């Protein structure tokens, strides 16, 4: 039967959505169906912070960060534990943790 | 709604639609096409005479086991070959 | 020895309520079958069928028995009970209790000319349970109960004499068939008719009038 009212994606009023490639397996998956997550990370791994700061030329350097958007196919997201299988009643929870 | 027309002058549509759809019925199609007279072995008849040819020990389906013989028969009016079952215990000795 | 624990049960034991008609009139929810058999002592209980139902476990299948019993007086009152138990005797007895608890009144009417006593139903009714839809149609006198042996017995316990039935869905499901027929006969008093259009003075409930002589 119909597992989800949304068919496991986000497409109402479109028909077609251009695909993206999974960042792990490079599988084509419609952009609305992907498990895109925005990863914003410090460059210095939060463990070399003091070492880099004390070895820097400038005092109170800003320490820029890196941004990327990771697009995930359903298989790769489940395997990498980006998402997990939930119970039937709380699959409907749209709210992020 | 409900599909079918509800016009007071739509009876031709209704009759034609029923005629078209009745062909989905197994017995109606068979009767109207005359498959009995054309391709049934008995030719539409309840009974038929024939002549016994040889010995066919049909093996039963599952879960079952019974393999002696069933008569292959050539029909008189058709010449068609037909397997027939001998319907009782030891009655194979009368249909040699 | 009954010893009820209910306002309504204590009232019925005390004898302030004499007819099941007051209970039906004031929609009091009965919960003790002693009430039902005290107000309708003449009802006959008889089982429609008993079937086995199995629940699978890591060690075999645990089998219980589900009994469908129908309680019905001579005229106007029936109830239907379905109960599953480990033993057939327990299933039968508990189904009898549930059927008594679920007793409803029947609006028996005339096909026409209102000469004798009401012999049929007042209006065409219908009940549904699962895919089974049971439709009851008033029939002229002497017609009998044109119904399958399952709901025919239920109608006989209701007290109707002449009635037609029309069944739809998979009617071999006896439980759903009997429940749909029970709904059909129940809706007869819910169908409003011109002879019922008259307004009524809205009397007081038995619990309210005899609240002083209750447990409180």
């Amino acid at each position: 039967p119909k597992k989800r009212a949304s068919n496991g994606r986000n497409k109402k009023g479109r028909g077609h959505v251009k695909p993206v490639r999974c960042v792990n397996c490079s599988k084509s998956i419609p952009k609305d169906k992907a498990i895109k997550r925005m990863a914003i990370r410090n460059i210095v791994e939060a463990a070399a912070v003091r070492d880099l700061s004390e070895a820097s030329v400038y005092p109170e350097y800003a320490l820029p960060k890196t941004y990327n958007k990771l697009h995930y196919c359903v298989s790769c997201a489940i395997h990498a534990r980006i998402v997990r299988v939930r119970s039937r009643e709380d699959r409907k929870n749209r709210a992020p943790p | 709604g409900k599909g079918k027309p509800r016009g007071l002058n739509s009876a031709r549509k209704l009759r034609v639609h029923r005629r078209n759809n009745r062909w989905a019925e197994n017995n109606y199609k068979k009767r109207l096409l005359g498959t009995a007279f054309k391709s049934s072995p008995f030719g539409g008849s309840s009974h038929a005479k024939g002549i016994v040819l040889e010995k066919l020990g049909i093996e039963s389906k599952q879960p079952n086991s019974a393999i002696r013989k069933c008569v292959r028969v050539q029909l008189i009016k058709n010449g068609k070959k037909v397997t027939a079952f001998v319907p009782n215990d030891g009655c194979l000795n009368f249909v040699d | 020895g009954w010893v009820p624990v209910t306002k309504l049960g204590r009232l019925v034991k005390a004898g302030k309520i004499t007819t099941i008609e007051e209970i039906f009139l004031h929609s009091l929810p009965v919960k003790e079958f002693q009430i039902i058999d005290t107000l309708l002592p003449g009802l006959q209980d008889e089982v429609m069928n008993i079937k086995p139902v199995q629940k699978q476990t890591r060690a075999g299948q645990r089998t219980r028995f589900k009994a469908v019993v129908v309680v019905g007086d001579s005229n106007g009152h029936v109830g239907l009970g379905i109960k599953t138990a480990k033993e057939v005797a327990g299933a039968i007895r508990a189904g009898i209790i549930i059927a008594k608890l679920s007793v409803i009144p029947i609006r028996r009417g005339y096909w026409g000319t209102n000469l004798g006593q009401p012999h049929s139903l007042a209006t065409k009714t219908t009940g549904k349970c699962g895919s089974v839809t049971v439709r009851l149609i008033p029939a002229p006198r002497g017609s009998g109960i044109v119904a399958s042996p399952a709901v025919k017995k239920l109608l006989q316990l209701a007290g109707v004499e002449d009635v037609y039935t029309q069944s739809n869905g998979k009617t071999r499901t006896l439980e759903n068939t009997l429940k749909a027929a029970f709904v059909a006969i129940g809706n007869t008093y819910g169908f409003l008719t011109p002879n019922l259009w008259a307004e009524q003075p809205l009397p007081v409930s038995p619990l309210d009038i005899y609240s002083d002589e209750a447990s409180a």
Binding site: - | - | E21, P105, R107, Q117
Partner: protein, 87 residues
């Protein structure tokens, strides 16, 4: 209803909702019978004398119980400035 010679038959003529004029079933266990006391010129209500309303479980489920009771009470005159016919 009756038979040919009168003789009231069809046991248990039933009650109807005061707001929708529809029958209350024998096992309509969501319906209510509201009793409102009357006050006799002294700030004290008459015991044993009340105005009664039968209210259907359908109305209560739909939630129009309060509006229907307001309208009936004002119609009976025991409410003054609550319910307005012209919404």
């Amino acid at each position: 209803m009756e038979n040919d010679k009168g003789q009231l038959v069809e046991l248990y003529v039933p009650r109807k909702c005061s707001a929708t004029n529809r029958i209350i079933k024998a096992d309509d266990h969501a319906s209510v019978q509201i009793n409102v006391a009357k006050v006799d010129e002294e700030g004290r209500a008459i015991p044993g004398e009340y105005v009664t309303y039968a209210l259907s479980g359908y109305v209560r489920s739909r939630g129009e119980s309060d509006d229907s009771l307001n309208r009936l009470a004002q119609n009976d005159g025991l409410l003054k400035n609550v319910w307005s016919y012209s919404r």
